[PDB]
């Protein structure tokens, strides 16, 4: 197998308000993502001939 990592999709960054400004919420929502994987493997083709 050959597994590669596919980067995860975009997640929005929150629009904080004015009350939030000056508080821990000012920093806004966390944007969090997990890499995903795609896997490649092999099959077989074979043939025989016989003189």
């Amino acid at each position: 197998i050959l597994t590669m990592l596919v980067e995860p999709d975009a997640g929005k960054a929150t629009w904080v308000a004015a009350s939030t400004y000056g508080t821990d919420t000012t920093t806004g929502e966390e944007v969090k993502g997990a890499l995903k994987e795609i896997h490649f493997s092999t099959y077989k083709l074979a043939a025989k001939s016989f003189i």
């Binding site: 004015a18 009350s19 400004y21 000056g22």
Partner: protein, 41 residues
Amino acid sequence: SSSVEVSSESYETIFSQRIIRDLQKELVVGALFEELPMSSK
């Protein structure tokens, strides 16, 4: 609210002095023609 620790009462807002017109009506008729510089009624 611009209210963290210390405050200013709207002194800050940049009152600005730039003016503008909404692509206002083109005038096309008034000037097209020519004038007969008349002297009376």
